[PDB]
Amino acid sequence: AFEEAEKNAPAIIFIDELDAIAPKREKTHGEVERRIVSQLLTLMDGLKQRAHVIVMAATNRPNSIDPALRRFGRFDREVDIGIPDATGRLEILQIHTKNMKLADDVDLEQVANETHGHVGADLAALCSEAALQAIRKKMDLIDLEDETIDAEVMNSLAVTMDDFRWALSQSNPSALRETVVEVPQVTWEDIGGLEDVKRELQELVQYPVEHPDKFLKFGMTPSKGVLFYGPPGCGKTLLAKAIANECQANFISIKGPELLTMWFGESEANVREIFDKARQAAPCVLFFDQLDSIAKARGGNIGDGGAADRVINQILTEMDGMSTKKNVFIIGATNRPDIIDPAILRPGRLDQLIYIPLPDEKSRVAILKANLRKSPVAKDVDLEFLAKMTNGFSGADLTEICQRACKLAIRESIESEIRRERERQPVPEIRRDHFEEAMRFARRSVSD
């Protein structure tokens, strides 16, 4: 190959997937692979110099390449093709859609703003999905078994803004296809009370993203750390569920002990991988449910050996180390914050500690209303009195009262149907007496 290139000089050689044939000779056991690396080293820079031949290469993992292949005279320059920003992905969309035919209502600015962590491949996938949706819209005209499509349907075929909206709804970064979970679709209306906490959560993600120039003028960097601590059942995980839907940033959900592994150094490698995955998809929200499982004070356990204490040390460097901060927002929910390592709780890592207490009388009315928004309930039932009696009840306790009332209503409804079927051979809404019977089984989950 090199002789053919030198024969027809000037020439360019492109080696796709360089890491496939150029691993480190120190870490390679196979003799053939090491001999190939040595041959590449000699050909690309050796005693007989190249006759004006340019060599190009592409690799996902530059750090797997042999160190001798990176010095000048041998892959002189390294060029970083990185994730585009909003303007870059707008340019990519404009380039992509020049061939495509689009309706007049399409707005590429909104599509560019909505796609946060997407790369050119992701934008191409979005365009293809939108076009497929347009074809689906024109499906009821055409027949699959027809020999050809009608000319009028072909002319009417175009990509509208609704197709792009649907594609955006289905769109997700290819880096984020493993760390994907199905969120139960909670909105800010589903949460009762916590109005001050709601405002802080929205502003924390919205301000750095929608108003980056405001921070530049005032000259201060944004704050991107939150810890939720409080009694069980008070809305810590609901706030994360609402963020997973309503907030305009990527979301990664981490169960606590997921990252831990049998092997010696893989537990900390999982921490590095999940933090690097969040940096690629910035702006991204990294949520740690049950943070006390992972972030526990060092020195507590004599024998783990030291893997538990080593994992938290990796998080400390990831959250705040010698690297430029990105738009990665880390939120943690803990039930017992007294055991969290004090290094985690310092400002710059988890600076904002928000305490979510038991709901008060005003909040309990809001919680009761939020549960009953989509439920048919008799007008007789007054939520103001019900919240007054339940004093130390949590948000989960109030929901359990409503669920048990529904079960009593369903039990009566089923019995009536059996009764009517029996005599042959009701309960439109939850009534006042259903809530009274459900209240006798109610109890305070969190003790004094």
Ligand X SMILES: Nc1ncnc2c1ncn2[C@@H]1O[C@H](COP(=O)(O)OP(=O)(O)OP(=O)(O)O)[C@@H](O)[C@H]1O
233 is in an annotated binding site: yes
Q: Select the span of 1-9, 87-95, 170-178, 355-363 touching a copy of itself (CB under 8 A).
A: 170-178
236 is in an annotated binding site: yes
Q: Does 270 bind Mg ion (CB under 5 A)?
A: no
- CA angle in degrees (0–180, nearest 5) for 405-407-412: 100
Of 237, 261, 352, 445, the one binding Mg ion by CB under 5 A: 237
Under rule CB under 6 A, which residues in 260-299 are in contact with ligand X?
A: none
Is-contact 235 367, C-beta < 8 A? Answer: no
Number of residues in contact with Mg ion under rule CB under 5 A: 1
**Token pair 């020999």: residue:** 147
Under rule CB under 8 A, which residues in 391-420 are in contact with a copy of itself?
A: 391-392, 394, 396-397, 399-400, 402-404, 406-407, 409-411, 413-414
Name which of 41 and 161 has its Cβ closer to ligand X.
41
Under rule CB under 6 A, which residues in 376-405 are in contact with ligand X?
A: 395-396, 399
- Checking the chain for breaks where C and the next N are over 2.5 Å apart, the residues before them are 176, 304, 425
- CA angle in degrees (0–180, nearest 5) for 76-82-85: 145
- For 360: left if phi > 0, alpha if psi spans -120 to 50, otherwise beta; the answer is beta
Under rule CB under 8 A, which residues in 64-83 are in contact with a copy of itself?
A: 67-68, 70-73, 76, 78
Name which of 193 and 292 has its Cβ closer to a copy of itself.
292
For the chain, the first-to-last Cα distance in angstroms comes to 79
Under rule CB under 8 A, which residues in 242-281 are in contact with a copy of itself?
A: 244, 253, 255-258, 260-268, 272
Of 92, 126, 159, 383, the one binding ligand X by CB under 6 A: 92
**Token pair 């929205």: residue:** 202
Under rule CB under 6 A, which residues in 16-75 are in contact with ligand X?
A: 41, 45, 58, 60, 68, 71, 73
Name which of 29 and 424 has its Cβ closer to a copy of itself.
29
Query: Residues forming the annotated binding site for ATP?
Result: 60, 96, 233-238
Annotated binding-site residue numbers: 60, 96, 233-238
Q: Under the rule (CB under 6 A), what is the footprint of ligand X?
A: 41, 45, 58, 60, 68, 71, 73, 92, 95, 120-121, 124, 191-194, 232-238, 320, 333, 335, 343, 346, 348, 367, 370, 395-396, 399
